[PDB]
Amino acid sequence: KETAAAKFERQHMDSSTSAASSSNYCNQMMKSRNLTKDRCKPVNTFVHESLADVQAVCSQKNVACKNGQTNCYQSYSTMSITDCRETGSSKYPNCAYKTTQANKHIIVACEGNPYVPVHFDASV
């Protein structure tokens, strides 16, 4: 099986680009990361920071997860992210996305030993 940690890296890390590459970034990235294989995943965030910097959020500010669990953590610093949101006219399998760049605090759920990000909860 793909581990929870690896899955978070696939779905949410893009340290290779320092900000939302082009207007086409989400369209390419949602596809290349396999977030369009079964359905068009409607929303998804990519983080443009080192793996270490994102992993470190698991020892930063403890906050309630959206589901009520207590294992979420907010970054003390803001991070470069891109939000991908499905357009009104996107129709699977031709999934279409608006690519928006921002700098925001991220909130991740962490689990395991080592204690590492396994879900992206929010950006604030």
Angle formed at CA 108 by CA 90 and CA 19, multiple of 5 degrees? 55
State whether CATH 3.10.130.10 applies to domain 1-124. Answer: yes
Q: Mention every residue, 6+ apart, whose C-beta is less than 8 A from residue 7.
A: 118
Residue 48: CB atoms within 10 Å: 20
| Structure determination technique employed | X-ray
Which residues are tagged catalytic? 12, 119
What are the structural domain ranges in the chain? Answer: 1-124
Task: Give CA–CA dist 85/71, Å, rounded.
Answer: 26
67 exposed, middle or buried (CB, 10 Å; 0-12, 13-18, 19+)? exposed
- Does 42 show up as a binding residue in the annotation? yes
- Joined together, the tokens standing for residue 13 give 């890390």
Task: Give CA–CA dist 44/30, Å, rounded.
Answer: 8
Closest to 44 measured CA to CA, from 29, 57, 58:
29
Residues 98-116: b if buried by 16+ CB within 10 A, e if exposed:
ebeeeebbbbbbbeeeeeb
How many residues are recorded in the chain?
A: 124
- Does 61 show up as a binding residue in the annotation? no
Task: Give CA–CA dist 54/23, Å, rounded.
Answer: 25
Please report the sign of the dihedral spanned by the C-alpha atoms of residue 6, residue 49, residue 64, residue 123: negative
- Joined together, the tokens standing for residue 91 give 């129709």
- Does 7 show up as a binding residue in the annotation? yes
Task: Give CA–CA dist 77/118, Å, rounded.
Answer: 19
